[PDB]
Amino acid sequence: ATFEIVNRCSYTVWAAASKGDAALDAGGRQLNSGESWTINVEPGTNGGKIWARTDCYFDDSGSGICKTGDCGGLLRCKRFGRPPTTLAEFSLNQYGKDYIDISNIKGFNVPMDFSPTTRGCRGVRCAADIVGQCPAKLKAPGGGCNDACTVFQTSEYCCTTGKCGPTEYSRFFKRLCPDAFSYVLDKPTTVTCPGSSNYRVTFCPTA
Template structure:
């Protein structure tokens, strides 16, 4: 296991309305009513996560659906690496009824709040709900312990382009 330092994320917010002072609300990915998001937004939201120039001078990148899904995403290197990742399935349109949310599809942890889905202690494995996400977006994290098929590396110094709604 590699400990990643300085892990950064970008999330998509939808259905937003803000005043001139940056106060307002978003239907998905809301950041406590603030335009300048300084933390994870409220689920459901699709996340691009990255830790640059880490262990053995590698960048670690992923698309996470652990907080659910609100928009499709491409996360592609523009130089220095050939492996991009994407999640462009119609997850909102195909979302299981129990996970549906206005503007998105919640992760089961958000809905059920149990260790089976949240992986708060000990080991956990894929569930029928995480398999729903994984089948549609094989490169994306579908539950918190989904590291082996969802974290990708590129050489440190690689440039990237994150595209929401490609």
């Protein structure tokens, strides 16, 4: 399956793609403002994620650091990135269907639209200004807006015991972006698409 990753932001981002234990495609690449990078993700990929990273520096071997989303200092991500990171999430060819969603469970750094480019389902979007409206105690000095599990490390925010409810913090994400997961046990906003669909992830989809 192809995912075209498009940076509509006015700033550079470094796209990253991983299923947690491996890169997807090259795993990572710089996208200047306006650039598009098309990756191929193997069918049957379960638990895939794509995200943006900001204010990165990499040396000639592709080692360095990003202020949001850093995946162990690599340009070419093989693991998930350091919060805060708005997440495009997908599981492909799961008993004949694709599942896609956006999640704010690991915080928010960059607005995002995640849409199929092929027929038979709708896209999801979290493009509100969550960084600018971020509650004081969630603001990441590094840039972006942390989820409350990252900041406070409690069973309630992290949903460790599997029994959590919504919180003042999760309700901020859900209000800014009703169509993204705001906490682990949020009512799902996962979209079911045809097996083997193709996709576009757009950073900063709106003005």
